[PDB]
């Protein structure tokens, strides 16, 4: 019965330990992603699937760490590394059992994020598979 899906591309670059703010939302059924807090308040408990790809800032920084975190627990991570300072995707895809009200969000652990304004390079997209 529940129908929830979302897909937001990154608009502005984010550096330092912080919660990346995905703003270019292309599809937001259910409206469970607030670009303001870069979070996914899951109102409907169940199983969700989230994939995310983050581009490395070319020319500035060499290794950037990214972690998808539910509440305060880091459930997935990626590491984009390139000595020559070229671009390289830090990407991952996860299936999670979200409870009622929990929040899942990307936290860059060092490194510099790169985000085409509308080239929608770095994306973060999820949808629910089963409902509890």
């Amino acid at each position: 019965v529940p129908r929830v899906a979302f897909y937001a591309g990154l608009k502005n670059p984010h550096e330092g330990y912080e919660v990346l703010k995905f703003d270019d939302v292309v599809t937001n059924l259910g409206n469970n992603y607030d670009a303001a807090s870069g979070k996914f308040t899951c109102n409907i408990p169940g199983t969700y699937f989230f994939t995310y790809h983050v581009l490395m800032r070319g020319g500035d920084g060499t290794s950037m760490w990214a972690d998808l975190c539910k509440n305060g627990q880091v459930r997935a991570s990626a590491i984009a590394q390139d000595a020559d300072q070229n671009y390289d995707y830090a990407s991952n895809s996860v299936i999670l059992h979200l409870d009622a009200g929990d929040e899942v969000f990307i936290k860059l652990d060092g490194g510099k994020a790169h985000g085409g304004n509308s080239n929608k390079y770095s994306t973060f997209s999820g949808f629910i598979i089963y409902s509890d």
Partner: protein, 158 residues
């Protein structure tokens, strides 16, 4: 209060400072948004034939975090902000490579000037693009010996 002009989606552009902004407006800014900071780079070439610095001033800078609403703040931070009034020669070829480029015409608080920009693909530049790149390269060469190299692109021409 500042008036803005967002020009994007073009390859080559030639303008005069009078067209963009009249003397009626105290302080205003003109904005460029490189289509892809990864596929294209910006090459700037201007000509100030007897530019009037006493009346107004021009500044150029790069920005990336949607900060054109805090320009004065940026002026305090000095984020790669450079004037072009004290420049010796009129034929300056500033080459940039950031998401956004802002040129501020500020009153201290006009067809003679000309400005031009080009976008160049870092891998396979277009024939006309490189070709006019060579043209103003020869213009720089003819002038003294100015530093007209500036990481010569792969563009090959006579």
């Amino acid at each position: 209060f500042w008036c803005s002009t967002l020009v994007k989606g073009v390859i080559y552009g030639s303008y005069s400072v009078s067209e963009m902004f009249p003397k009626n407006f105290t302080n205003c800014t003109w904005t460029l948004e490189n289509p892809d900071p990864t596929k294209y780079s910006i090459y700037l070439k201007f000509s100030k034939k007897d530019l009037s610095c006493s009346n107004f001033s021009l500044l150029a800078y790069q920005f990336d975090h949607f900060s054109h609403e805090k320009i004065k703040d940026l002026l305090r931070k000095n984020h790669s902000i450079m004037q072009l009034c004290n420049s010796k020669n009129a034929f300056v070829f500033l080459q940039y490579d950031k998401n956004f480029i802002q040129i501020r015409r500020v009153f201290p608080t006009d067809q003679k000037s000309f400005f031009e920009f080009l976008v160049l693909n870092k891998v396979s530049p277009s024939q006309f693009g490189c070709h006019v790149l060579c043209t103003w390269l020869e213009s720089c060469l003819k002038s003294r010996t100015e530093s007209c190299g500036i990481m010569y692109t792969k563009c090959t021409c006579p």
